[PDB]
Each structure stands twice: as C-alpha cells, then as structure tokens.
Amino acid sequence: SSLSPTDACVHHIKRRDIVLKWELGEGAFGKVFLAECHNLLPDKMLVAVKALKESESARQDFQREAELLTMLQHQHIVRFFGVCTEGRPLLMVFEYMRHGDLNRFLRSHGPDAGEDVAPGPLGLGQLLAVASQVAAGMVYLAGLHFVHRDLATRNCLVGQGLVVKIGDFGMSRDIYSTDYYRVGGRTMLPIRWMPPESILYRKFTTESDVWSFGVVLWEIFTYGKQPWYQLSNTEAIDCITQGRELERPRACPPEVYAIMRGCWQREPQQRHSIKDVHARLQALAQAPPVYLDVLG
Numbered sequence: 585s586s587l588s589p590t591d592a593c594v595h596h597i598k599r600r601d602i603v604l605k606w607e608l609g610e611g612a613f614g615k616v617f618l619a620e621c622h623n624l625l626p627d628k629m630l631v632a633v634k635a636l637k638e639s640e641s642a643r644q645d646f647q648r649e650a651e652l653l654t655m656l657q658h659q660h661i662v663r664f665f666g667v668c669t670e671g672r673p674l675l676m677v678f679e680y681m682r683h684g685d686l687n688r689f690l691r692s693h694g695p696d697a698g699e700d701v702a703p704g705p706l707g708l709g710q711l712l713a714v715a716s717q718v719a720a721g722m723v724y725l726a727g728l729h730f731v732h733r734d735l736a737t738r739n740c741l742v743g744q745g746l747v748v749k750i751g752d753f754g755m756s757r758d759i760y761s762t763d764y765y766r767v768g769g770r771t772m773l774p775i776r777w778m779p780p781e782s783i784l785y786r787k788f789t790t791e792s793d794v795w796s797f798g799v800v801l802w803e804i805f806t807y808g809k810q811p812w813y814q815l816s817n818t819e820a821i822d823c824i825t826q827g828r829e830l831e832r833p834r835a836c837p838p839e840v841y842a843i844m845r846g847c848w849q850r851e852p853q854q855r856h857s858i859k860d861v862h863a864r865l866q867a868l869a870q871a872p873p874v875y876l877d878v879l880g
C-alpha cells in the first residue's frame with residue numbers, strides 16, 4: 585500500500601506448510617509471526633508471516649498488494665514468498681530479517697545503547713554500507729516508476745550479515761506513532777520525512793523520494809534519532825516549508841552531509857536522481873580504509 589505508480593502471478597503456500605512459532609509484532613490491521621515454512625526453497629526455513637485482521641474491501645486490497653509485492657523482487661527489497669488464502673486469516677509470507685527494523689538496529693548500535701557487528705557504535709564504513717543498500721532499493725523502485733510514500737529507517741529491515749532491505753509489515757503507524765502527524769480522521773502523514781511540495785502542494789513524486797532518502801541518510805548518521813526531534817509537528821512543518829535544513833550529524837563527514845544537502849534542494853527538478861545519490865554513497869562504502877579514515 586506504501587507504493588504509488590508514476591492474480592495468477594501470486595505464489596501460493598499451503599497452510600500446513602506454515603508452522604507459527606510466536607508473535608513478532610502487532611498493528612491495528614493485523615499481527616506478524618515468526619513461523620517455520622516447509623518446502624519453500626530446496627527443506628525448512630524461518631519466515632515472517634503477516635496475518636490480515638478480518639472484509640471484502642480489505643480482501644481486494646490484499647490481492648492488489650500481493651500482486652504489487654510479487655512484481656517487486658530485488659536484492660534490496662524484503663523478499664515476499666507469497667500468500668496463504670486457504671481460509672482465514674489471510675497470510676502474506678516474507679523472509680525473516682533477524683535484526684528487525686533499521687531504526688531499532690541503529691538505536692541499539694548507537695552511543696546511547698556480536699555475531700554480525702563489532703562492539704560499540706557502528707563505524708563510518710558500516711553506516712555507509714547501510715545508506716548504500718537503502719539507496720540501491722530506491723534506485724530499483726524509481727526504475728519501476730514507483731513512489732514509496734513512507735521511506736524511513738523504520739520501513740527498512742536488517743538481516744543476518746547486516747543485509748539492509750526496504751520493507752515493512754504495515755505496523756509503523758502503530759509502533760512509531762510519533763513519526764506521524766494525524767490529519768485524520770484515519771490519515772497519518774510522515775511529515776518529518778516529507779518535502780515542501782508534499783506539505784504545501786500535496787504532490788509526491790520520485791523527486792519527493794530523493795528528499796525522504798536524504799532524511800533516511802540523516803537518521804542513519806544520528807543512529808536512528810527522529811528528524812526535528814526538538815520540534816512539535818506544526819513547528820516541523822514550518823521549518824520544512826520555510827527552508828530550514830537538518831543540521832550535520834556529529835558522526836557525519838562534510839562529504840556525506842553534501843549528499844544530504846543535494847537531496848534537499850527546494851525545487852524537485854534541482855535534486856540529484858536516486859541513481860547519482862546511490863553511486864556517490866556506494867563509492868564511499870567500498871572506498872579503501874586509507875581514504876575513509878581521512879573523511880571521518
């Protein structure tokens with residue numbers, strides 16, 4: 585549902601092939617469970633199962649969503665294995681990402697907090713690796729002419745070996761309620777991540793995702809701090825619309841902050857494409873230690 589453009593293709597899994605272990609989370613629209621899935625990939629593997637709460641309006645939304653998720657298959661997009669429409673509750677099966685959402689991962693590996701990562705805070709090299717993988721996922725989405733209306737570290741997942749992918753199970757509005765401004769009665773906007781054209785003109789395009797990516801880049805270098813944390817929602821709207829930009833994170837080199845600033849050009853057409861933003865961050869991620877040591 586987070587995607588905006590500009591039933592046979594959907595894979596099906598038998599309910600007996602899914603063995604629920606325990607809950608991982610919950611929202612107003614459903615629950616997420618860790619489960620064992622048999623005969624999915626050649627014997628048994630762990631998966632995250634999203635159970636849809638209750639209905640014919642939601643069932644067609646489920647069908648459209650599964651079709652969209654089937655289309656969206658790439659190295660930095662959370663893997664969607666298919667559905668179980670064999671009775672109720674309707675289930676969506678995703679790969680299991682051991683470290684959970686990227687916001688929680690960053691916070692737990694920040695100065696205010698060992699199989700996959702070293703002790704203490706994440707180094708410059710790993711923060712650049714995290715940013716580059718999120719940018720790669722957006723390059724793929726932009727390439728398919730898709731707009732992600734809620735790009736943020738809470739909407740990214742981290743797996744074994746610090747593999748980062750864009751994806752969520754629709755519970756961010758419940759889990760991270762303060763990251764949204766209620767305009768209601770049932771609408772919540774992620775204003776802190778939204779560009780001026782979204783707030784002022786209610787327009788959201790591929791260029792608006794470049795802005796949101798710039799905010800994601802800032803979350804990463806602040807170890808998951810909320811953008812404009814010092815401000816109420818209306819104060820945040822005032823800053824974004826007046827042109828006040830997020831300040832350089834302590835852990836962020838001037839070279840990386842230059843990438844954030846390029847994402848935050850008031851005029852959409854003036855912002856660099858996600859392709860160029862990814863190219864620059866990837867170069868920095870795979871740059872020799874000698875070069876990286878003199879940046880940070």
Ligand SMILES: Cc1onc(-c2ccccc2)c1NC(=O)NCc1ccccc1C(F)(F)F
Nearest residue numbers: 585586587649656661662676750751752753754
């Ligand atoms: C706000 C919201 O409400 N329901 C959902 C929802 C629906 C069905 C499956 C999971 C999540 C939702 N999230 C949402 O659409 N996220 C997009 C997403 C989710 C999983 C995998 C990939 C992706 C994508 F590539 F970024 F598009």
